[PDB]
């Protein structure tokens, strides 16, 4: 089997991407944030505290003939940006772009933090990291991908995020028309439950390539590119007027600037992020100070190849018994 679904930026800055997902019988379609950095599939629901729902589409398990309460199961998660959610668990039929999984754990939110409430466009998350990170207790549950894997033509999914444009998540096959040149594969460590890999280095603009190992995770659920302070300092030094602002919470730059590109290494291959991808606009409405798309990972504890990096590439998440990651230009 295979599946193929379009993923769409939630706003003009590509702050996140939503993908339609069919849940239950008859189908209830929710727009979920596919997140390769976590492993819970959770949704706004009829059980969510009413004051914490503001425009989202909710899942109503009582209206699904295939929904079953997973007795005694609860979940609770907190993300890297400080947001959180929690609730109980159903199993139900879940389909993504024509690919169907029966008995998928659908985690129903009873509580969500303010940032989820305030984002009307995101109806929940669909985690695509390794199932070892799943927070369901007392019986850990599998991700949609892990459940589908045995049925897929090939045990892979691919992320093809667009810049200011729609893109695609495919399951079970590699679309050889979706990228240029070849796909370069690189080793993955699953020791922390992430799609963790080691970049071979970087370049700023037309500058010389610096060979240096940068361990980080491929994370579709994170907007920005978070890298070591040395690397990030080297990037923003090439932008006149750029500076790190503690009050804003990272590097900002004059909106009149032209940003240089940023290149990262995948083995001997190179992925180039155009400068425009690194612009996240005025820090507040009307401001001439703009927020940068490359930020320091110093306060995070891990380097994160988020959407800023990933949308410059066609990315293969290979879930073979020894998982690997593939990157191609596009
Ligand atoms: C809800 O999405 C957002 O607020 C975006 N800023 C993407 N995002 C979402 C989560 Br959860 C996170 O830990 N980091 C992040 O960049």
Swiss-Prot record:
Say which residues of the entire protein are included here.
Answer: 90 to 419 of 419
For the Peptidase A1 domain, which residue ranges apply? 17-328
Active-site residue list: 35, 199
- Family recorded in the similarity comment: Belongs to the peptidase A1 family.
Organism encoding this protein? Cryphonectria parasitica (Chestnut blight fungus)
Query: What name goes with this protein?
Result: Endothiapepsin
GO MF, one annotated term:
aspartic-type endopeptidase activity
- Tell me which domain of life the UniProt entry assigns to the organism this sequence originates from: Eukaryota
Please list the reactions this protein catalyses: Hydrolysis of proteins with specificity similar to that of pepsin A, prefers hydrophobic residues at P1 and P1', but does not cleave 14-Ala-|-Leu-15 in the B chain of insulin or Z-Glu-Tyr. Clots milk
Q: Spell out the disulfide connections.
A: 255-290
- Which GO terms of type biological process are on file? proteolysis
EC category: hydrolase
Q: Does Cell cycle show up as a keyword for this record? A: no
Q: What is its EC number?
A: 3.4.23.22
Lineage start:
Eukaryota, Fungi, Dikarya, Ascomycota, Pezizomycotina
- Keywords associated with the record: Aspartyl protease, Disulfide bond, Hydrolase, Protease, Signal, Zymogen
